[PDB]
RNA sequence: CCGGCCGGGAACUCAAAGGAGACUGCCAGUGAUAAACUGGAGGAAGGUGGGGAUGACGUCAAGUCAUCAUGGCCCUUACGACCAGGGCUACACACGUGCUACAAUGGCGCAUACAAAGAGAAGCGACCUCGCGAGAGCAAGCGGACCUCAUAAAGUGCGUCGUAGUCCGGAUUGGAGUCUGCAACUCGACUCCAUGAAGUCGGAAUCGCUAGUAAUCGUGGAUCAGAAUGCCACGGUGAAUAC
RNA sequence: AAGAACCUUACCUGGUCUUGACAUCCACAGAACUUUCCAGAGAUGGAUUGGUGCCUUCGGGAACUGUGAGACAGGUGCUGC
């Protein structure tokens, strides 16, 4: 119930639980379970410690949690200090993939700031 | 309000098409452009001859142009020296062999296009538009049209406020689809601007 | 077998065409299977009518390609030449096939 | 409308029981034109309530409806300054429609799980005058009783 | 439209027809997958050197009677306005007002 | 982005300028308009004035811009903020 | 001998052949139970037979095309109705009083210009 | 070789032509013995059956000189023309019109049924092989009731989730990629992996709709090299209400 | 607006052209056409391999190109009062 250094829920099925690892979604969770030979509908608190060890080994293959976080952070910071268009967009906290900013863009710009 | 074209709303019902050539999506655009060019050239070169209608068919890599005209002698000329040149140029424009056939139009006074052209020519010549309209209506109702409506719109008589005036006699039931409403428009480029003439002629039913 | 595909923009005219097709193919001696009506292609177009704005003011036009099929099983030698010399009226496209 | 409606639309009685009353109930419960889902939910609720109680599905449904059906409602009339909440007696078709609608509103607003469970529980409560539906009927009758002075109209 | 605009379109059509074959060849090298890296590179460079107006994507359909770049209809080669006018005057075969 | 089968895209004239400038040493900034061109590995150290609509923004090419369009480092809009 | 009828509903067309037999109903080479998932559809198919009380003494061979489940069910119902019409004319009054002879002439209304659907106008605002 | 597959059949569904039908025609009552109305039979349809096209005289000196034509004025080493880059895609904000949601009438997984209408020749692209997928290779067939687009989805059967900002919800962003196009940075669509936001039904106010309509589910087309949640059509399921 | 990456595009920054990109008409020269090299962001300018014909009053015209003055051409410039 502690894979890649984080607590994962014991009450949920294995596929749903493994998605709690920052870096594993449904697809990677299914791949991990298949490679470790564990049913997709088994609940975490009902796996043998050997099975959890194998799961640890599998999830160790992929970059997750802190390593992934700092990888993403160094990619963003490289964009930043290069100061290309995407670096400038990231600095200003505006949409980065060519969306419209005349309206919407609330996810990047934050909620309404009245004048 | 605006009104539907008395020709278009009746094309499939009591009118014919001014073009009955069949072609597929590869040929439709080119044939339409060539028909437009031929009609434009014919009208420009036969402005004097009073060409009432131009029908175009394309049987098989050929173009047949029937020119319903009011002065067939004028458009043909001596023997056929004029229609021969017209056919040559039409064939050159269409890129295919041509065949021009002149059609007798009896009574230019019951044909909407010819009435409109006459009225526009008078307007260019600066005749009173009320007199031109009354003459047109009287001529048609004496030739025996069951009804006629004439409308002239624009800067009539050098006015600075454009207005629309229309005379009418008999019946012109534009809503009945089976009624024979021959309708046509023309423009008169006067020195005070453009003046639009529209003519409806109701000639009968089925 | 001889296959005649008649395409026209007018059902009355195409009916005239196919009638005289079958009359010629029967006077020549051969027997005919038809005419067969194949579905009309109703090509529809929608166009704004004002030169400026007014989006809800539209005309809807329609082009009805009518199509008839003529079959000539047992194609007589005179039948073939008669059909190919017949020369249909304008406004009809005829495709001849074997 | 200012003219008059023709006869009401024909309704095909539901297959399991052949009751147009239940057909109307299914239609009222239906959402986004998913009559299959509505019928399955209604049928599950009916069998569940029949099993919990003992009554036949149809008669138990009738009892639950009757405990919710109103008799007089209030409509608005204009004279001036204020409005009259005039009490008017209801016709039976509107009675059944209102009873069904109130039952379905209460069932949807209940906090259970499957809507069949919600509907069975709500109808069971109506079978002894407990649901939000019977509460709404209570409110309607006591409002009409309060406004009874305007009944003469 | 403008006479200059129509002239531009004519020039683009002429260049596309003139240089069509070479563009076809070079794009064949590029999208061929068993062509050497040197071949694909030189083909990219030569396709660059070919004039831009040769690209058939550079063209813009125009109403042949007015040059209008909007509202085109490929079946007729005209914009909506010209199609409406000709259709009502009967200068389009078979076409007539639809109702269904 | 560009399909990998087609490889990277460099405009021929900019490639010529770059190869000649690199083989003939440090020179004037490469005045160029090819914003759509790719920064190749042998681009380092070159100062290139990439057009942006009215100006030729100078860009000192370094290692970490390899594989990026030169037009990305020359912004084409001006913005400082509303009612500052 | 086989008695034939045609039913239509929405855009469904159902050819229905009836011949006296053991009460077997075949829809598109498939039994009714596993061809129609909706008990409403099964009721719709069997409605004329049960209302004329001839449910077991006829055999149905039916082929239907076009439409959806309910449209096809109505097409089947119309097909049996007409097949029994041309079987006997005596049950005509009963079937009309029931309301099965009538072909329900209700199609999907065409979409119109300036509306989102048949009648759903775009949302209007004074300003 | 269970596939109309082949021989065949012309019945049937369909395809397209031509006809018939519905007219207040008949009956009853009401009604100024009139128009007509309230019903009833018959009939597929009963009262202009449903829908569409059809927009009267005229009103707003309403809109368009940027489709076009056009009087008058104006520019003409130019206010015309050519070219490459950029912008029309900018964002403290405000409004309109929509899409997806806020979940269990649901989500996900597996199996499976039922459509109409349209398109297509530097076009639609089978089958097969490869790729996890966008797609790639070879490549038939078809200007077509033949071939392709193109397995409809909602629905049904089983399991799962068990009310939680959640297997809801999909924004945003990182990495890796496919296709079109000379070229995808400004500024494309799509795919895989990852991230997983706001949102728990929305104040005053306000909109659409009386039938196969609303609601809901998918499909096609025009424009188009690529680029729809828009627009225009098509069918599937399918109500409540009108005193 | 039935669909702005370049085009569209009418706007902006620069590089350029002015009887002009597109029309007639005047004269002269030259068949056109095709390919190739340089410079320039491209426009555009230098060249030039090949080509030098189609009818013929065989001498010239028909086309297609450049040049040379124009009469003009061009305007998505204003005015929908
Ligand atoms: Mg112009
Ligand atoms: Mg384009
Ligand atoms: Mg709209
Ligand atoms: Mg009328
Ligand atoms: Mg204005
Ligand atoms: Mg815009
Ligand atoms: Mg999800
Ligand atoms: Mg398409
Ligand atoms: Mg497209
Ligand atoms: Mg629909
Ligand atoms: Mg641009
Ligand atoms: Mg005005
Ligand atoms: Mg005004």
> What DSSP string describes B171-197?
---TT-SSS-EEEEEEEEEETTEEEEE
Q: What is the extent of the structural domain holding F47?
A: 2-82
Q: Chain F within 8 Å of E45 (Cβ-Cβ)?
A: yes
Give residue D149's region: left, alpha or beta (phi > 0; psi -120 to 50). Answer: alpha
Q: Are E96 and B17 in contact (CB under 8 A)?
A: no
Q: What is the DSSP letter of B96?
A: S
| Helix intervals (H) in B46-172 | 72-76, 81-94, 112-124, 129-143
C52 CB contacts (<8 Å, ≥6 apart)? Answer: none
Does residue F6 belong to the interface with chain E, where contact is any CB pair within 8 Å?
Answer: yes
d(CA E15, CA E9) in angstroms, rounded, equals 10
Which of C9, C10, C45 is closest, CB to CB, to E73? C45
CB contact at 8 A, G81 and G26:
no
Residues in a beta bridge with B184? B199
Domain boundary residue, one of B86, B106, B126:
B106
Question: E1-6: which pairs have CB atoms within 8 A and are 24 or more residues apart?
Answer: E1/E62, E1/E66, E1/E67, E1/E68, E1/E69, E2/E67, E5/E62, E5/E67, E5/E69, E6/E62, E6/E67
The secondary structure of residue B19, as a DSSP letter, is B
**Residue B155: closest CA among B108, B181, B191, B198:** B191
Same domain, yes or no: B170 and B153: yes
Q: Which helix (H) or strand (E) holds C19?
A: helix C11-27
Residue E74 belongs to some domain of the structure: yes
How many domains does chain F contain in total?
1
Q: Return the H-helix or E-strand segment holding E97.
A: strand E96-97
| Same-domain status, B99 and B115 | no
Taking the CB of residue G63, how many other CB atoms lie within 10 A of it?
A: 14
CA atoms within 13 A on the CB side of C11: 10
F53: left (phi over 0), alpha (psi -120 to 50) or beta: left
**Helix (H), strand (E) at residue C36:** strand C31-48
Count of C-beta atoms within a 10 Å radius of residue E68: 18
Does the CB of G96 have a partner CB in chain D at under 8 Å? Answer: no
Backbone φ and ψ for D33, nearest 5 degrees, come out as: 60, 50
Closest nucleotide relative to residue E51's CA, C1' based? H182
G14 DSSP β-pair partners: G7, G64
State yes or no: chains G and B have 3 or more CB pairs below 8 A: no
* CB-facing half-sphere around the CA of B201: CA atoms within 13 A: 25
Q: Which residues contact F74 (CB under 8 A, 6 or more apart)?
A: F35, F50, F51, F52, F56, F57, F59
Q: From its phi and psi, is residue F20 left (phi > 0), alpha (psi between -120 and 50) or beta?
A: alpha
Angstrom distance (rounded) from CA C38 to CA C69: 7
Nearest CA in chain A to F64: A82
For B151, the enclosing helix (H) or strand (E) is strand B147-154
Q: What does the alpha-carbon distance between residue C23 and residue C16 come to, in Å, rounded to a whole number?
A: 11
Q: Do B24 and B69 belong together in one domain?
A: yes
Residues paired with D85 in a beta bridge: D76
Shortest CA distance to D42 belongs to which of D30, D54, D59, D51? D30
Residue D33: which residues within 8 A CB-CB, separation 6 or more? none
Six-digit token pair at F44?
């380092």
Q: Which residue in F has a C-alpha nearest to residue A83's C-alpha?
A: F73
Domain of B35, CATH number, reads 3.30.300.20
CB contact under 8 A, F12 and E48: yes
Q: Show the domain range for C12.
A: 1-98
Task: Give the domain extent around G64.
Answer: 1-127
Quote the CA–CA distance of B52 and B62 in Å, as a whole number. Answer: 23
The whole-angstrom distance between residue A24's C-alpha and the CA centroid of its chain comes to 6
Is there a contact between E90 and B21 if contact means CB atoms under 8 Å apart? no
Number of domains comprising chain B: 2
Run of H or E residues at B195 = strand B193-202
DSSP, collapsed to helix, strand or coil, labels residue B192 as coil
Q: B163-170 and B181-190: which strand pairing?
A: unpaired
**DSSP string computed for E24-60:** HHHHHHHH-SSS-HHHHHHHHHHHHHS-GGG-GGG--
Q: Is C73 left (phi over 0), alpha (psi -120 to 50) or beta?
A: beta
In a domain, E100, yes or no: no
Question: How far apart are the CA of B178 and the centre of ligand 11, in A?
Answer: 52
Q: Which residue is nearest to nucleotide H97 (CA to C1')?
A: G123
Burial track G19-40 (b if 16+ CB lie within 10 A, e otherwise): eeeeeebebeeeebeebbeeeb
Q: What does residue E3 show for φ and ψ, rounded to 5 degrees?
A: -60, -40
C-alpha distances out from residue F7 to C33, E31, E41, E71, F33, Å: 60, 11, 8, 38, 21
Backbone φ and ψ for D108, nearest 5 degrees, come out as -65, -40
Nearest Cα residue to B18 out of B182, B205, B204, B202:
B182
User: Are both B192 and B101 inside the same structural domain?
Assistant: no
Residues of chain F positioned with their CB less than 8 A from the CB of E50: none
Q: What is the C-alpha to C-alpha distance for residues E15 and E22, in angstroms, rounded to an integer?
A: 12
Sequence-ordered alpha helix ranges (H) in G8-121: 32-35, 39-52, 69-87, 92-98
Rg (CA), chain D: 17
B117/B123 Cα distance (integer angstroms): 10
Locus of tokens 């609608």:
D101
Q: How many Å apart are CA F84 and CA B139, to the nearest integer?
A: 78
Total number of domains constituting chain C: 1
Total number of residues shown for chain F: 84
Compute the distance between CA of residue B158 and CA of residue B167 in angstroms, rounded to an integer: 20
Residue B8 lies in a domain: no
Listed residue (D117, D40, D18, D12) closest to G37, CA to CA = D40
- DSSP single-letter state for residue F76: -
- The superfamily (CATH) of domain D20-147 is Ribosomal protein S7/S5 (1.10.455.10)
What tokens were used for E88?
Answer: 């009502």
CA–C1' distance G125–H207 (Å)? 8
Q: Which residue, G52, G48, G50, G56, is CA-closest to G16?
A: G48
Please name the residues in contact with G1: beta carbons below 8 A apart, sequence gap of 6 or more.
Answer: G19
Cis peptide before B91 (omega within 30 of 0): no
3-class secondary structure, B130 = helix
Q: What is the DSSP letter of G82?
A: H
**Maximum CA extent, chain D:** 54
Those residues whose C-beta lies under 8 Å from the C-beta of residue C30, and which sit 6 or more positions away, are: C72, C73, C74, C75, C76, C79
Structural domain harbouring E47: 1-90
Which residue out of E67, E93, E94 would a mutagenesis test of the B interface target, given it has the greatest number of B Cβ atoms within 10 Å? E93
Q: What single DSSP character describes residue B56?
A: E
CA distances from D72 to B205, D76, D150 (A): 64, 13, 13
Q: Are B110 and B139 in contact (CB under 8 A)?
A: no
Nearest to B205 by CA among B177, B168, B169: B177
Which ligand sits closest to the CA of A25?
7
Q: Tell the residue number behind the tokens 């001859």, with chain if given.
A: B49
- Is residue B205 helix, strand or coil? coil
Residue E95 placed within a domain: no
Task: Return the beta strands (E) in C49-80 as ranges.
Answer: 58-73
Backbone φ/ψ region at C37: left (φ over 0), alpha (ψ -120 to 50), beta: beta
| Nearest residue in chain D measured CA to CA from G99 | D10
**Residue F4 at interface with chain E, using a CB cutoff of 8 Å:** no
**Whole-Å CA distances, C21 to C34, C70, F39:** 10, 8, 71
Q: Does any CB of chain D come closer than 8 Å to the CB of residue G73?
A: no
Q: Which domain holds residue B87?
A: 16-106
Q: Is the CB of F16 under 7 A from strand I?
A: yes
Are B103 and B75 in contact, with CB atoms under 8 Å apart?
Answer: no
CB atoms within 10 A of CB E5: 14
Q: How many domains does chain G have?
A: 1
Q: Which of B117, B17, B34, B30 is nearest to B69 (CA)?
A: B117
Q: DSSP state, F65?
A: G
Fill in the DSSP letter of residue D9. Answer: P
Whether B94 and B112 share a structural domain: no
Q: What is the separation, in whole angstroms, between the first and last Cα of chain D?
A: 23
Which chains lie within 8 Å of chain G at 3 or more CB pairs, if any? C, D
- CA distance to B33, E1, G40, per residue, from E4 (Å): 20, 8, 69
Write down how long chain G is. Answer: 127
Please give the helix or strand (H or E) that residue C83 lies within, else none: helix C77-85
Q: Which two three-digit tokens encode residue F51?
A: 């057009």
Contact residues, chain E, for C45 at CB < 8 Å = 73, 75, 83
Residue with tokens 């010819």: B114
Residues 6+ apart with CB under 8 A from B130: B165
The Å distance, CA of E9 to C1' of H143, is: 28
Resolution at which this structure was determined, Å: 3.4
Q: Whole-angstrom Cα distance, residue C92 to residue C66?
A: 10
| Residue from F52, F65, F69, F73 to probe the interface with A (highest A Cβ count within 10 Å) | F73
Rounded to 5°, the CA angle E89-E94-E96 comes to 60
Separation CA B8–CA B135 (nearest Å): 28
Q: Would you say E59 and E53 are in contact if contact means Cβ atoms under 8 Å apart?
A: no
User: Scanning every residue of chain F, which has its alpha carbon at the shortest distance from the alpha carbon of A86?
Assistant: F72
- Partners of B183 in the beta sheet? B200
Using CA atoms, how far apart are residues G23 and G8, in angstroms rounded to an integer? 23
Closest to F30 measured CA to CA, from F59, F8, F55? F59
Q: Are E89 and E80 in contact (CB under 8 A)?
A: no
Query: If you ran DSSP here, which 8-state letter would residue B57 be given?
Result: E
Helix A26-35 vs helix A49-61: angle between axes, to the nearest 10 degrees?
120
CATH number for the domain spanning C79: value is: 3.30.70.600
């Amino acid at each position: 119930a502690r894979i890649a250094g984080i607590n994962i829920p014991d009450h949920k099925h294995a596929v749903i639980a493994l998605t709690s690892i920052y870096g594993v979604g449904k697809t990677r969770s299914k791949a991990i379970l298949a490679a470790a030979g564990i049913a997709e509908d088994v609940k975490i608190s009902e796996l043998s410690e050997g099975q959890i060890d194998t799961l640890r080994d599998e999830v160790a293959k992929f970059v997750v949690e802190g390593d992934l976080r700092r990888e993403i952070s160094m990619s963003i910071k490289r964009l930043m200090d290069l100061g290309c268009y995407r670096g400038l967009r990231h600095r200003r906290g505006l949409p980065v993939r060519g969306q419209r900013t005349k309206t919407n863009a609330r996810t990047r710009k934050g909620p309404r700031k009245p004048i | 309000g605006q009104k539907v074209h008395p020709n278009g709303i009746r094309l499939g019902i009591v009118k014919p098409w001014n073009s009955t050539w069949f072609a597929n999506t590869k040929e439709f655009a080119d044939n339409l452009d060539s028909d437009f060019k031929v009609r434009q050239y014919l009208t420009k070169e036969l402005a004097k001859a009073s060409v009432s209608r131009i029908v175009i068919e394309r049987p098989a890599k050929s173009i047949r142009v029937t020119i319903h005209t009011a002065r067939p002698g004028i458009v043909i000329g001596k023997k056929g020296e004029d229609v021969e040149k017209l056919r040559k140029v039409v064939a050159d424009i269409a890129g295919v062999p041509a065949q021009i056939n002149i059609a007798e139009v009896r009574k230019p006074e019951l044909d909407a296009k010819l009435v409109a052209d006459s009225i526009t020519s008078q307007l260019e010549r600066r005749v009173m538009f009320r007199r031109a309209m009354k003459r047109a209506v009287q001529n048609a109702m004496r030739l025996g049209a069951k009804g006629i409506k004439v409308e002239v719109s624009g800067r009539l008589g050098g006015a600075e406020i454009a207005r629309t005036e229309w005379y009418r006699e008999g019946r012109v039931p534009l809503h009945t689809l089976r009624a024979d409403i021959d309708y046509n428009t023309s423009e008169a480029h006067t020195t005070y601007g453009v003046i639009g003439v529209k003519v409806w002629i109701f000639k009968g039913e089925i | 077998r001889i296959r005649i595909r008649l395409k026209a923009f007018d059902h009355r005219l195409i009916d005239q065409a196919t009638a005289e097709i079958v009359e010629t193919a029967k006077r020549t001696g051969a027997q005919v299977r038809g005419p067969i009506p194949l579905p009309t292609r109703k090509e529809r177009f929608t166009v704004l009518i004002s030169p400026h704005v007014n989006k809800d003011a539209r005309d809807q036009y329609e082009i009805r390609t009518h199509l008839r099929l003529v079959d000539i099983v047992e194609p007589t030698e005179k039948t073939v030449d008669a059909l190919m010399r017949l020369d249909l009226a304008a406004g009809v496209d005829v495709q001849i096939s074997l | 409308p200012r003219r008059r409606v023709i006869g009401q639309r024909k309704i095909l009685p539901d297959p399991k029981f052949g009751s147009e009353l239940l057909a109307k109930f299914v239609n009222i419960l239906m959402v986004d034109g998913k009559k299959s889902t509505a019928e399955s939910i209604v049928y599950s609720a009916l069998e569940t309530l029949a099993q919990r109680s003992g009554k036949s599905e149809l008669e138990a449904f009738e009892v639950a409806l009757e405990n919710v059906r109103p008799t007089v409602e209030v409509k608005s009339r204009r004279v001036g300054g204020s409005t009259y909440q005039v009490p008017v007696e209801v016709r039976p078709v509107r009675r059944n429609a209102l009873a069904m609608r109130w039952i379905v509103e209460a069932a949807r607003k209940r906090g259970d799980k499957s809507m069949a469970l919600r509907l069975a529980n709500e109808l069971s409560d109506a079978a002894e005058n407990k649901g939000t539906a019977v509460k709404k009927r209570e409110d309607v009758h006591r409002m009409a009783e309060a406004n009874k002075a305007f009944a003469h109209y | 439209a403008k006479q200059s605009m129509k002239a531009r379109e004519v020039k683009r059509v002429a260049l596309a027809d003139k240089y069509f074959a070479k563009r076809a060849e070079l794009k064949a090298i590029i999208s061929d997958v068993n062509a050497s890296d040197e071949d694909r590179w030189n083909a990219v460079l030569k396709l660059q050197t070919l004039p831009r107006d040769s690209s058939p994507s550079r063209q813009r359909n125009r109403c042949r009677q007015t040059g209008r770049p909007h509202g085109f209809l490929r079946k007729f080669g005209l914009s909506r306005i010209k199609v409406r006018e000709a259709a009502m005057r009967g200068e389009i075969p078979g076409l007539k007002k639809a109702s269904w | 982005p560009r399909s990998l089968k087609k490889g990277p895209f460099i405009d021929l004239h900019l490639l010529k300028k770059v190869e000649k400038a690199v083989e003939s040493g440090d020179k004037k900034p490469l005045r160029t308009w090819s914003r759509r061109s790719t920064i190749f590995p042998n681009m380092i150290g070159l100062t290139i004035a990439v057009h942006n609509g009215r100006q030729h923004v100078p860009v000192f090419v370094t290692d970490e811009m390899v594989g990026h369009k030169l037009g990305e480092f020359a912004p084409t809009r001006t913005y400082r903020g509303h009612a500052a | 001998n086989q008695y034939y009828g045609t039913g239509r509903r929405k855009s469904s067309a159902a050819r229905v052949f009836i011949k006296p037999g053991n009460g077997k109903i075949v829809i598109n080479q498939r039994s009714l139970e596993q061809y129609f998932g909706r008990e409403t559809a099964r009721m719709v198919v069997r409605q004329p037979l049960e209302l004329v009380d001839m449910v077991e003494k006829l055999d149905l061979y039916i082929t239907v095309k076009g439409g959806g489940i309910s449209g096809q069910a109505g097409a089947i119902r119309h097909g049996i109705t007409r097949a029994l019409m041309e079987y006997d004319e005596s049950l005509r009054s009963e079937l009309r009083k029931a309301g099965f002879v009538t072909r329900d002439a209700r199609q999907v209304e065409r979409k119109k210009v300036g509306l989102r659907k048949a009648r759903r106008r775009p949302q209007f605002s004074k300003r």
